[PDB]
C-alpha cells in the first residue's frame, strides 16, 4: 500500500547538519576541557546512550552546558559529533584509539565494533 | 579513507520518532484548528520550508504552540508529520488530494511531485 522515500532520512540529516552549521536552534554546548561544541539535544539523544541519560535526568535536562570528562580527547569527541550529523567516520592511525575510547564513553558500541574491524583490516 | 555508515541516517530517524512517541524533548505543539500534534522544531525545520520560516521568525521562534491554517485537512497534516519522522507516505485514493494540498502548503514540492506520479499510475 505504502510509499517509502529511500533518501528521506539522509536528507533530514543533511538539513540538521546545515542547521548546526548556521547555529539555528542549537540548544546545548558540550564542553571537553576548554573546547566547546554546539549541538541539538535530540540528535545527541538519538545517537548516544550517554546523552539520552543526561537529557532525561531532571537535574540536567534544562542545562545549556554539559561538561563531559575533561580527560576525553577533544579531537575524538569532534570526530564522533561530526559522525552523528553526517554518517561519516573519519578514522586515522593517529586518532583511532582516541575515537574508540570516546565511542565507549558515549555508549555507541557499534562505532567501537567498526573501529575493531578497521584495525583487523590492516 | 572515510567510513560511511549507510544505515545511520535512518537509525537516527527511527530514534527521533521514538523520542516523539515517548514525548521526550518535544518543544512544540502544532495546532490545526482544534487538533494537536506534538513535534520537535528541528525535525520540522529540516523537512519543510514553511516550518523553517516559522521557527526563524522572531515573533514566533519562542512559541510553544503554533497554528497552521485552520482550514487544512488535519488527516493530511497527520500523514505528513508521520512521513517526516518515518520516510513512509501512506497514500490512498481517499487521502491523496488532502495530502497533496497539505504538501504544497508545507512547501514540500518533492512530496507533491510524488502525489502527481501516484495520480499518473492510478
Amino acid at each position: 500500500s505504502c510509499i517509502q522515500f529511500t533518501r528521506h532520512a539522509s536528507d533530514v540529516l543533511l538539513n540538521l547538519n546545515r542547521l548546526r552549521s548556521r547555529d539555528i536552534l542549537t540548544d546545548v554546548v558540550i564542553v571537553v576541557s576548554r573546547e566547546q561544541f554546539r549541538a541539538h539535544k535530540t540528535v545527541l539523544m538519538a545517537c548516544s546512550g550517554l546523552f539520552y541519560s543526561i537529557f532525561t535526568d531532571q537535574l540536567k535536562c534544562n542545562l545549556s552546558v554539559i561538561n563531559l570528562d575533561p580527560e576525553i580527547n577533544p579531537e575524538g569527541f569532534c570526530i564522533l559529533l561530526d559522525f552523528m550529523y553526517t554518517s561519516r567516520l573519519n578514522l586515522r592511525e593517529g586518532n583511532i584509539m582516541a575515537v574508540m575510547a570516546t565511542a565507549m564513553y558515549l555508549q555507541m558500541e557499534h562505532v567501537v565494533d567498526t573501529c575493531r574491524k578497521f584495525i583487523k583490516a590492516s | 579513507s572515510c567510513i560511511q555508515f549507510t544505515r545511520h541516517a535512518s537509525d537516527v530517524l527511527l530514534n527521533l520518532n521514538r523520542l516523539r512517541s515517548r514525548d521526550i524533548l518535544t518543544d512544540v505543539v502544532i495546532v490545526v484548528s482544534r487538533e494537536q500534534f506534538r513535534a520537535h522544531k528541528t525535525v520540522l525545520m529540516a523537512c519543510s520550508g514553511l516550518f523553517y520560516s516559522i521557527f526563524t521568525d522572531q515573533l514566533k521562534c519562542n512559541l510553544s504552540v503554533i497554528n497552521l491554517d485552520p482550514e487544512i485537512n488535519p488527516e493530511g497534516f497527520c500523514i505528513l508529520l508521520d512521513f517526516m519522522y518515518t520516510s513512509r507516505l501512506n497514500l490512498r485514493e481517499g487521502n491523496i488530494m488532502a495530502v497533496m494540498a497539505t504538501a504544497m502548503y508545507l512547501q514540500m514540492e518533492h512530496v507533491v511531485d510524488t502525489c502527481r506520479k501516484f495520480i499518473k499510475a492510478s
Binding site: 505504502c2 510509499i3 517509502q4 522515500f5 529511500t6 543533511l14 538539513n15 | 529540516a46 514540500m108 506520479k117
Partner: peptide, 13 residues
C-alpha cells in the same frame, strides 16, 4: 511497499 529515491526539495539556507 513501494520505494522512491526522489530527493527532498527543501534545503535549509
Amino acid at each position: 511497499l513501494w520505494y522512491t529515491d526522489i530527493r527532498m526539495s527543501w534545503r535549509v539556507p
